[PDB]
Structure formats: structure tokens, C-alpha cells
Design a protein around this nucleic acid. Sequence first.
RNA 1: GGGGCCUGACUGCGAGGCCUGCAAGCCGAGCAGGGGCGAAAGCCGGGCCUAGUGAACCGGUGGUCCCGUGUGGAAGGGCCA
RNA 2: CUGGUGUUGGCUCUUGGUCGCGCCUGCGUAGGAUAGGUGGGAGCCUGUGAACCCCCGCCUCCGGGUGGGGGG
Lengths: 73, 148, 221
Amino acid sequence: MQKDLHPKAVPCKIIYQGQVVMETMSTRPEIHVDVWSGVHPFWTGEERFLDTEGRVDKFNKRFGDSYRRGSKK
Amino acid sequence: MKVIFLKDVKGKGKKGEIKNVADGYANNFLFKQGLAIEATPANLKALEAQKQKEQRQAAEELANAKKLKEQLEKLTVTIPAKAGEGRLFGSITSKQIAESLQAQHGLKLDKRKIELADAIRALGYTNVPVKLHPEVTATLKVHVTEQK
Amino acid sequence: KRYRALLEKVDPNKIYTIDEAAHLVKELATAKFDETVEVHAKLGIDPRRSDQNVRGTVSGLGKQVRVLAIAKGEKIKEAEEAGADYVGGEEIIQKILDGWMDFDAVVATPDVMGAVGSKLGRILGPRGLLPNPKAGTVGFNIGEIIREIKAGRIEFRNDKTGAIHAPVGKASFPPEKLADNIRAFIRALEAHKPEGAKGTFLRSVYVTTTMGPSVRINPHS
RNA sequence: GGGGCCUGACUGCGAGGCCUGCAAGCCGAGCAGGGGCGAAAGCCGGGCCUAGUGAACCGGUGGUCCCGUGUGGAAGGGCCA
RNA sequence: CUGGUGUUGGCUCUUGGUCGCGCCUGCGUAGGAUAGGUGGGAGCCUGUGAACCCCCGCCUCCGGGUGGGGGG
């Protein structure tokens, strides 16, 4: 569990697949891909209870960094 | 972005200046730096707070002023010195004014105050427009005499 | 002077009403004799495709409506006797462009209308004098058309650049009557609208008196 | 093979048979509304025939005003073509 | 490999479109056009009360103006 984001959870799930559209605008569609993948944000530097660094990602970030809920800057 | 100013935006007007210096942008440069804060219910408050405080200061002194204001405006400037038949031998410097007025009538008023072309020397009844507080002061009656 | 006078009497950004505007038109044209009031405005369409061409007539004339008859011979005769008034040919066309305009209504015999639309298009198309077909004024029955003129129709037909216009209020005809026909035109044209035409119909709508001030109005009141 | 006007080279239908393991495919008097040819008896539901061809779905578009996921609407759909 | 977006903040230099407004502005050969054109005709008989007609010089082929001088 070393990839997440401290404030909340955001790694995982994510199943993509492509097709060849062209539908509600006269005639149906068609199905293709069948794949799974990653998907996330971004981490950075701050500190908790005597050093630590943090990590977390974008969102939460803008947040908890702006402030702090279980450690600080 | 609720840019809570603590100086510049131009040069330093740390007054009522919350600008939209947007996101991580303003965010990090500006306040990481250390030149203000984000709204923070705590600081929206802050600002309204210390501003209030200065307001008390201002109106307030307006008052200290006014009290000393009408009282003195009413009274009479009584000053005794030496001379001949028109102008004292040692010139009147309102410095001397203060020394005296405070010394004998009791109130405490500056020096840099008043309005004076310069030292006067032709006795008694001559009055001085004397600045006192930044928008109101007292033009008053001054009398001096050679107690002879 | 004559016009700074007028220029301060109306405004630089407001859409008044038909009766009201009227009161101002008269307010403005004290001028010599009387200054005929008309309506002039913009048709959101396009003229480069005969399909939108908004033309025909809208609803005073009479056994009083002096008429000219544009023809080449047999039709000079026919217009004549039928009951024209000023009959002639491309010659009558050139005189009208030169400095002649007496006829009230003008008819043309489908063998000179090219002449009628191009020499005097800009001579007849203001007050309405450019022989208008499915608008009783053009036809091998020039005599027939001149005979019918009377009833009380005053036409309209979009100019190549998009503005339509004509007489909607004598500067003297009661501000009520001014509102009356201004409105009626709102109707006739408004409807006249061309089929394949979208966007927003009545762009800029103004009333005035040829030479002078032009007030923009809301042909919905 | 020509001329005359005309267009049923129509909808709603068809009793009853051909060929048929399937769906097809094919045929038709008469009946109704509505025409057309003649004076009329009557023919005319494409063509002298037997080839000029095709599921079911999946979608479009010109009517329907049946369904419309709280009811009033409409997306959307059912049927006609 | 590649357009938009995210933490990728400041400073200044710059050319493009667009609608809006503000005044510009021409050629289908005396009936196919006058300063384009459609609504006109060049004023249906015309407009600040300074250049009014006659007269030089100044601004993107010019009127907008032009300084007037001049003025029945």
C-alpha cells in the first residue's frame, strides 16, 4: 500500500475498450477492445510528526496541503 | 483562488487585496514565499478584525483630540515674558508655548504642532492657528506681555 | 440649419412603439410642404437565391391613383384605353430616371420589365413604381392590371441588400394611422417571409421620412 | 403496325386451385369505394409469356397521433409506407 | 510519436480572426451604374448662422476636411 495518496484512495480498477461508434446518428454500433489498465494523479513533498515527506496526489493535495488533517508542512 | 494579500500585487498594498492569482500558481509562489494567506475563515475574520482595531484607533484619537479641542479652543493663552514696548528681548517660540501652557494651564500639547511663520515678539493679543489633529486643530487666542 | 435641430429630438439607442415613434416622425419633419413617412428595415435571409425574395403588397388609393403604362406598341394602346394615364416606352423609363415622377402606380407589359427593373429599379422601387407581377402590375393584360389598381394596396419588396420599405404614414396622417399602417406592414411583410429562411427575421426596423431622421421600433407594438 | 382520349403499371379484398417436405413461388372470377375506354355488350388490379433476384435482423425518411416507465410533455418505440 | 489538461509560475515583444461601434469608399461606357449599389432624383425645389458662389494650399487617388481670401 505504497502508491496511493494518504488523503483518500485513488489507484486501480479501470477497464478500457474501443469500438467503432457511429450510432444514434443513423444506424447502430460495434464492440472491440477488452483491456485493463492503471489510472492515477500525482504526488509531492511535505511532513508529519517529525519528518515523513508525504506523497499523496493532486486533488487531496491541493486540499490537505492547503490545510492538514492528520499531519503538516 | 482567494489570494489573501500581505503586501504587493504592485508593490506592497497589504490592504483588502485578495486577487485571483489562481491555483498552485499564486499558491506556491506567493505564499510559500511568504507574503500572505488563503481566505481561511480564520483570516477573512483576521482582516475584518485588525481592520476594526485600526478603526478604533482612528476614530478614537479623533476623540482624544476633540476633547482637548473644545476645552482649549475655549481657554485663554496666558504668557509672561520680558521686553520693552512691543517685542520681547528673547522672542516667543511656541516651544516656549508648550513649556508654558502645559506647565501652567495643565495640558500636554506638542511643539511641531501649531502653525507659525516663526517666533513672534509684538506681545499679548495675537492668535495662532495651531494644527493639533490631522483634519481639525485649534486656531486660538494668545496673549503675552512683558510682565514688565 | 435644419438637421442638428432634428438630431437632438430623437435618441442614439432605444426602440419606441409605432404610435409614439409616429409622434416623433412628425415631431421631426416640419420641413417644406410635408415629409412623407415610410418604413425601412433588414430581412435576415439572402437575396442571391430568388427563393427568399420577399415581395408583393400590403394593405387608400382610388380612382385617384394616376398610373403609368410601360409598353412597346400594342400594349401602349391597351394600357391606354384600358385606363392607364401616362403611357410610353423605355422612353418613359428614361424620363422617369431623368426627373419625371407623376404616376401613382406603374404597370409594365412583359416585354420591357427588364427595362423597368434596371433603369428605374432605382426610380420606382422606393415609393413603389417598378411593375410588380404576382402583385397586379405586370402583364399582357396591362390594361387589366391598370384597371384593377385602386382597391388600396401599397407594395413592398426587399432590395438586393436586404432592406424592405415604402409609405407607412403621411407626416400628417394621424399618429394613430401612422401606427395603423406601420403595424399592417409588420404583418404583410412579417408573413411574406421566404420559406427556406431561418436565423432571426426582422433585424433592424426603422420608420422616418425619406430625407431626415430614422427611428428604430419594435413592430410588435 | 397507326391514330383518339387515358393511366387501375388503383386501396380494401379475395372464393378457390397449381408446384411445395420449408418458406416461397405462382393464379383468379366476384364483392366495395374510385376512376377510364366505348353509345354500349364489356375490358382495365402494368406490359405476350417463362428470367430482369433474396430471409431475418440491423438502422433512415414521408404519415400514425397506439405506447409514453409519478401524470402534463418528449427522447424513445409500436404500425403504414 | 502526437493535440487539450493537471501540479507547468513571472516578465515583455507580437501577428491572426471576430462581432460591435465610429467615420471611410468604387466600377457593368449619357436608358448597365455617378462620387458602388439597392430605398433616390442627385435633392421630389433644397441647410450652423466661417471660408456662401470666384479664388490657393493641406491630408492613402479624394472628400472629410482645407486656411481662407472672396462673397449676388
